[PDB]
Design a protein around this ligand. Structure first.
Ligand SMILES: [Se]
Lengths: 84, 170, 183, 180, 182, 175, 182, 182, 175, 171
């Protein structure tokens, strides 16, 4: 799943700290506040979602939803490119 | 169940998950105090309390479904059906404690510790719960002090979780 | 209904001035230490969620906040609540969560211009230190400082009337209407 | 060098052009995301995050530069003449800025300073004085009216009421938008 | 009396600026090494509790601190003490725990704006290094640095008068009022 | 009382509680220096100084009330009544020393060691030592005692720990 | 006699990070079991003396180690060797004792920041267990863990290039320079 | 007047920045391996006590350290030494224990702000690896790294002047003033 | 060779090197389990199986080249040529075991012991076991052998030591 | 008596026992006592374990609690006895013990690394190193120059001055 990991890394590198806080707030409910406090990058949150099986290369619904909420379709195109 | 499975689980966990796993099994290992998680799992296996279902429940409590699918080859349906049909290794009180700890950042934990210094290092909420248990201050039938202290740090949601547990005990 | 996403959109439609207004209107529930790091709307909501004042089944405080800041567009678009409803809901006694004393203060901030704010600061020279009277201070922060110095309050409106009379008369009308409501 | 071209285009825009572009892009960039936009380039980047500006899609940037009457930048940095844009925007589909928005901006193009004073005086009963301060242009008044749900695509009554008291061409623009 | 809960609420009603003011006002009792990690009010209280300057039976220093930072709302709400009482309590000699030299200094920090602070920093160029004169420094840190370089003190107010006279007259009046109490 | 009780107590305690329990019984185990806690309990039982009440007091001093309820089936009131009716196995001096040690972090203990190194004669040992180890070293040098607390009092005053000085003063006043 | 004192002085001027670098650069000669207890420079020196790669007549490996970790001050002051002399000596193909693969890995670790290291660890989730991805793991320990799983090597640079492309562009340049040197 | 108590009080009045300054000023006497675990002032004192540079009869080096970091308050309060005295003591030749080259460097660190430090680190990109140029490093650590790479020294000031000229001119004045004292 | 040489070798080695040397000569053991290394060397000399080349190989296996040059007056090239031209005193199996043991830190050794306890048991209660001690325990239980390395291969694979698995595969290919 | 020797042997710690054996290395001639109990038994049998000898031994290991509990003597009494009577343990052994107590494991390791040239083991105490040097004729009450220089090279000038003070105390 290394292409999926490079997807997640490119998406994490293409996010700002404010967008990271927005993603943290959006994922509250699936991830605890204590775990969210330790998140210092989008890749950390994506991996935490990978462990909880709320996110996988087969089911990218949560990633697409989180990224569409942040009205960032430029990375949605990266996701769609990975899907093909 | 074998040593390879325990090794895979031990290598896949992080320090915080290990500390949480040690806390959840405090009720089943009351005599011995296992130092590391590997020793805890070995003791549970030797005593016949670490079947595939028991380890599945342990992985389900730490929300590590990737390990349930990769190591034990189990989905959420299997572990939930096993928990419905079989008695639980970890009581709902420990799960409530862990959930409350996960919904608290370090600042909230520091403020909570400052409130309870009258009745009693960067220590986690579970360490505080262990200290309170050693002092006979918190228990599955003794949550009033923790409820009041969580109310005083403006954490009414955790007070509501505690009240929901109390109503679920009825 | 993604409650978190809906709250995120509501926060995305709010600027820093609306955020400061909401923080002032929520002073009775969020202390100064917890209000200091609030630099966006979302975090504010989180604090409310920690006090069980904002959830998917309790939108009363959010609707009241959006109504008091005159953001009826957010009320109609994201909360499905019209202008008339929020009025009746707030006319029933007990049902108001924001104190009438707070709202009144905010309404005073609605009728003060920049030169009028400068005159306000000049009128509060003997009661407040210069550090809290700098040009980067809005009227709500001046109200907060007055409350800190127990110069402003629900029972102490003397200096407020004195300073308002030197600038405009409609502010005194708002103050007197608030006083006439709290008989 | 698409990035250098965007940087040069942004460098040739002042603060008034930036406010005009930010108002014309209200339907795609929310208020919180528009607040920290203090230069033109920072706006373009936001569009790039919404897939409305790339080296293969210059339609929205050209439309913005055409609606702001900055044809010099269109000819110098984008190699596009006025007629090209006329033809492009006369087709009923490729226009990305809503006709309701454009109309509003065009009203701001046909209002003087005394007319702005008359507008502000005409919106006393609906808008507080703090939002009617002397540093408020007609676009900010439109934004405040939209916030207070008095102005909208279906609510143009107060707009016609205030415009008829000042000038007839404003009501003519409103009626032209309505007939379209 | 939930003394810890009361202290927690008082700290929750304090921001970082009030915390820095309290830390400056407690310089005569808490050294620099012990003051460096103090990033919240509660911690500060603990230090006071280690010197018995804060207990359930001794609230004098806490009340004095809250009065000197002009937080009378906390004094009336959580400590049940009004403005007049404190004043009388602080007019009796001996009972004042914060030195009059410190208070004066803090009051000067109350009457300096941003441009006046910039002028202060520009006036203290030959006595203080540039690292301590950057725009991110407040007036209390300048007071601390001047005390470190033995140019400001309870007996050495000359340079303070020199820099204050170049900006405003009320600062010199405050200095002279402090001097008259001798 | 039985061997199972001693085994449960020894296996249920943690390292800090064990080290503290060894220190508290220093006054009653003078003839032997027990290495581990189990040997200490065995010695106390053989010499007739480990009844159910004695072990209850020992668990109460290390604040292990969960073991008081699970093993010995006792509450705090019962152990306090037993201490009221019978002479104590652990003197108030040891309890005071332990209380002072619990209110001292590694930084406070290090600063306290630095102040006393003139009277110690101890060399450069870098192993982070607990306050109870410092008390043991002072006892070996006849520098601290239930009737000799002035040096510890002054050193706690000099590290700005006036609360522990007040604990020492209240202990002195209780005599 | 003085040789031991010189070794001791060189070791006293070495920190823990330089020590870890020295241990990594000497991995091809000292296995992990003997390298784990190496917590001081003198112990490393002792091991080298036990393998005769460090003697009063053989300072070549010590000079190479001190030069590759960019500790030229110790090289010039305690070993009487200049930077240019070392460059010239190491341009000869035979005299290099530390493999270019090791030096290349070390330089990559020299050109990775803390956030870049976190991204590296996040990029190696499927290949390395989580226990070995703790925040206390430096990049050299990750290189060792990759070598254990035969994921990193002189002939296997694919995953290294993948993660470097996931973090920074200069790292691929270093890798390609090493590969073109062959 | 207990020597240990006096040293403890002096250490309690020192923060982490003063501690780093003292550790840098004592680089010529305490090597890197012994400097790494120094996280408080007392430890530092102990090292000096092991070299007989700090005892109840030898306060010269301690006074020099406290004077060079401009902590005259501690000198007057705990050592009974005024500002002028030290000056004369340090004007007599030979008696200065901290080298003029070291002091100079530290004084440069006194005249560099945060943005100026960022500009310095950005100016040293081609000469120092990124790992040693991280944002968590003050100017003294950059000086140490430069000394390690033998680009900075008492006889090698070319790159120092080059980078200082890119930021400020007073730094070049300090460098030239130090150079004339030779 | 002579008695002075054996004495110098015995005095120059450390405990770990002594244990490794004892393990390498386990296959040559003449119906005896020598506790000390000096006794082992004396037995090998008496049995004519400790020439200068044999001791040179023994010192070469423990990577003590300083002792190889000071005592036996040899370099690495000479001993390597001797090993190339003459049959070895220590079989390639023991050398492989020693190499694998040297490439394992305490954590890997602990994880390897934890995996082996299912096939072997707890064994010696000591928690400080070397890899060579584990190999000896497995040999006594007929679990590892020069013709039976599949279990060791699997256990090294499970601790993510594929390089050691490749070492074992290279040994298997060389036979 | 034997009860006193048993109490002393049970009351001492491992480091104190090793230090006592090192201090009594010069008085136990021809024999190498393994444990402290055997050493005390040999001293008693040989007539070298009076009350004053045991007092001096307990004072050298700085174990004043045993001086007060067992022998009923203060530090002043033992110090006056040492002033008035010849010592059982020479000042050289006391200096060695003092230097050893002021040395951490790292300092001892660096000292062993410096001295390994003059003596062709891990976790060795300073007293063990001193015993090894004495058996090799490298240190002696009249031969401290090498130890002095080696302490100077580990930047331990305080111990070098302790050695110099001992040299001045010899005359
Ligand atoms: Se005796």
């Amino acid at each position: 799943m290394d292409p999926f990991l490079v997807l997640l890394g490119s998406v994490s590198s293409s996010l700002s700290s404010s967008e990271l806080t927005e993603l943290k707030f959006l994922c509250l409910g699936r991830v605890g506040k204590r775990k969210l406090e330790r998140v210092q990058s989008g890749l950390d949150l994506f991996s935490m979602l990978l462990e909880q099986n709320d996110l996988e290369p087969g089911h990218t619904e949560l990633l697409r939803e989180l990224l569409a909420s942040l009205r960032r379709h430029d990375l949605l195109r990266r996701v769609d490119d990975f899907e093909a | 169940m074998s040593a390879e499975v325990i090794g895979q689980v031990e290598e896949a966990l992080d320090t915080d998950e290990k500390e949480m796993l040690l806390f959840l099994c405090r009720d089943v290992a009351i005599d011995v105090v296992p130092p590391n998680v590997r020793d805890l799992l070995d003791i549970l296996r030797e005593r016949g309390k670490l079947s595939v279902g028991d380890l599945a429940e342990l992985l389900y409590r730490v929300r590590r479904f990737d390990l349930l699918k990769r190591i034990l080859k189990m989905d959420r349906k299997a572990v939930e059906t096993h928990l419905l049909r079989n008695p639980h290794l970890v009581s709902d009180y420990r799960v409530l404690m862990a959930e409350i700890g996960e919904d608290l950042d370090k600042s909230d934990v520091s403020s909570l510790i400052f409130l309870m210094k009258d009745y009693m290092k960067e220590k986690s909420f579970l360490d505080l719960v262990v200290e309170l248990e050693k002092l006979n201050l918190v228990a599955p039938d003794q949550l009033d002090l923790l409820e009041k202290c969580l109310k005083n740090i403006h954490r009414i949601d955790l007070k509501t979780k505690i009240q929901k547990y109390k109503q679920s005990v009825q | 209904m993604d409650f978190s996403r809906n709250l995120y959109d509501i926060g995305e439609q709010l600027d820093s001035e609306d955020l400061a207004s909401l923080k002032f209107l929520s002073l009775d529930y969020i202390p100064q230490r917890k209000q200091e790091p609030i630099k966006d709307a979302l975090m504010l909501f989180q604090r409310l969620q920690e006090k069980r004042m904002l959830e998917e089944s309790n939108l009363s405080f959010l609707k009241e906040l959006l109504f008091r800041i005159n953001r009826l567009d957010l009320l109609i678009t994201y909360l499905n609540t019209r202008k008339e409803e929020m009025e009746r809901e707030l006319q029933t006694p007990g049902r108001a969560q924001i104190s009438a004393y707070r709202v009144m203060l905010y309404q005073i901030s609605e009728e003060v211009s920049r030169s009028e704010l400068r005159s306000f600061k000049g009128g509060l020279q003997e009661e407040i230190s210069k550090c809290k009277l700098d040009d980067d201070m809005n009227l709500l922060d001046i109200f907060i400082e007055m409350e800190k110095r127990v110069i402003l309050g629900e029972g102490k409106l003397d200096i407020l009337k004195r300073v308002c009379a030197q600038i405009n008369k409609s502010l005194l009308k708002i103050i007197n209407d608030y006083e006439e409501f709290s008989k």
